[PDB]
Design a protein around this motif. Structure first.
Motif, PDB file in Angstrom:
ATOM      1  N   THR A   2      57.307  31.789   7.907  1.00 59.78           N
ATOM      2  CA  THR A   2      56.323  31.777   6.657  1.00 59.78           C
ATOM      3  C   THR A   2      55.160  31.064   6.828  1.00 59.78           C
ATOM      4  OG1 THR A   2      57.957  31.008   5.263  1.00 59.78           O
ATOM      5  CG2 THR A   2      57.271  33.154   4.748  1.00 59.78           C
ATOM      6  N   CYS A   3      55.521  29.620   6.414  1.00 59.17           N
ATOM      7  CA  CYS A   3      54.696  28.658   6.646  1.00 59.17           C
ATOM      8  C   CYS A   3      54.282  28.252   8.257  1.00 59.17           C
ATOM      9  CB  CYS A   3      55.039  27.444   6.073  1.00 59.17           C
ATOM     10  SG  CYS A   3      54.396  27.080   4.252  1.00 59.17           S
ATOM     11  N   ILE A   4      52.966  28.038   8.637  1.00 59.60           N
ATOM     12  CA  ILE A   4      52.431  27.886   9.813  1.00 59.60           C
ATOM     13  C   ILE A   4      52.529  26.460  10.195  1.00 59.60           C
ATOM     14  CG2 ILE A   4      49.956  27.232  10.123  1.00 59.60           C
ATOM     15  CD1 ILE A   4      50.582  30.665  10.847  1.00 59.60           C
ATOM     16  N   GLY A   5      52.295  26.123  11.313  1.00 55.34           N
ATOM     17  CA  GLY A   5      52.460  24.592  11.880  1.00 55.34           C
ATOM     18  C   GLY A   5      51.060  24.088  12.124  1.00 55.34           C
ATOM     19  N   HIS A   6      50.624  24.529  13.238  1.00 61.10           N
ATOM     20  CA  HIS A   6      49.334  23.841  13.964  1.00 61.10           C
ATOM     21  C   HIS A   6      48.844  24.795  15.125  1.00 61.10           C
ATOM     22  CE1 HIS A   6      52.149  21.701  16.336  1.00 61.10           C
ATOM     23  NE2 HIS A   6      51.392  21.528  17.203  1.00 61.10           N
ATOM     24  N   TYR A   7      47.736  25.114  14.999  1.00 61.31           N
ATOM     25  CA  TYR A   7      47.175  25.857  16.054  1.00 61.31           C
ATOM     26  C   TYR A   7      47.806  27.053  16.435  1.00 61.31           C
ATOM     27  CZ  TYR A   7      44.440  21.493  17.391  1.00 61.31           C
ATOM     28  OH  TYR A   7      43.687  20.485  17.309  1.00 61.31           O
ATOM     29  N   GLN A   8      47.939  27.942  15.451  1.00 63.12           N
ATOM     30  CA  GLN A   8      48.493  29.204  15.295  1.00 63.12           C
ATOM     31  C   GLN A   8      47.535  30.484  15.530  1.00 63.12           C
ATOM     32  OE1 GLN A   8      51.587  29.206  16.760  1.00 63.12           O
ATOM     33  NE2 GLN A   8      52.001  30.953  15.558  1.00 63.12           N
ATOM     34  N   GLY A  41      35.355  30.363  16.946  1.00 59.97           N
ATOM     35  CA  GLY A  41      35.487  30.236  18.360  1.00 59.97           C
ATOM     36  C   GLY A  41      36.607  31.163  19.138  1.00 59.97           C
ATOM     37  N   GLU A  42      37.908  30.730  18.681  1.00 60.99           N
ATOM     38  CA  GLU A  42      38.844  31.703  19.606  1.00 60.99           C
ATOM     39  C   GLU A  42      39.530  32.730  18.406  1.00 60.99           C
ATOM     40  OE1 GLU A  42      41.828  30.784  21.913  1.00 60.99           O
ATOM     41  OE2 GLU A  42      40.379  29.857  23.552  1.00 60.99           O
ATOM     42  N   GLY A  43      40.098  32.173  17.437  1.00 62.19           N
ATOM     43  CA  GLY A  43      40.795  32.594  16.412  1.00 62.19           C
ATOM     44  C   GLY A  43      42.205  32.268  16.060  1.00 62.19           C
ATOM     45  N   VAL A  44      42.186  30.876  15.754  1.00 65.48           N
ATOM     46  CA  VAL A  44      43.542  30.246  15.295  1.00 65.48           C
ATOM     47  C   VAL A  44      43.425  29.367  14.249  1.00 65.48           C
ATOM     48  CG1 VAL A  44      44.334  30.611  17.707  1.00 65.48           C
ATOM     49  CG2 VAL A  44      43.146  28.692  17.314  1.00 65.48           C
ATOM     50  N   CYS A  45      44.771  28.916  13.823  1.00 64.79           N
ATOM     51  CA  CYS A  45      44.663  27.922  12.650  1.00 64.79           C
ATOM     52  C   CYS A  45      44.685  26.659  13.107  1.00 64.79           C
ATOM     53  CB  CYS A  45      45.653  28.156  11.700  1.00 64.79           C
ATOM     54  SG  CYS A  45      45.409  27.722   9.940  1.00 64.79           S
TER      55      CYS A  45
END
Length: 47
Positions: A1-7, A38-42
């Motif tokens: 569920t919870c994301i980390g980094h650069y997803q 830019g690209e499309g990430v978190c």
């Protein structure tokens, strides 16, 4: 569920959790916003 980094946010609708640091007098709340300019990430944010 919870994301980390650069997803991936474009081809994935997941909640970007917040990585808040601890320990020490100096604190830091590392957030993660879904950047689609830019690209499309978190990537990291808040500061």
């Amino acid at each position: 569920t919870c994301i980390g980094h650069y997803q991936k946010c474009v081809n994935a609708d997941k909640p970007c959790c917040s990585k808040t640091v601890r320990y020490g007098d100096s604190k830091n709340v590392r957030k993660f916003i879904c950047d689609r300019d830019g690209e499309g990430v978190c990537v990291p944010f808040d500061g």
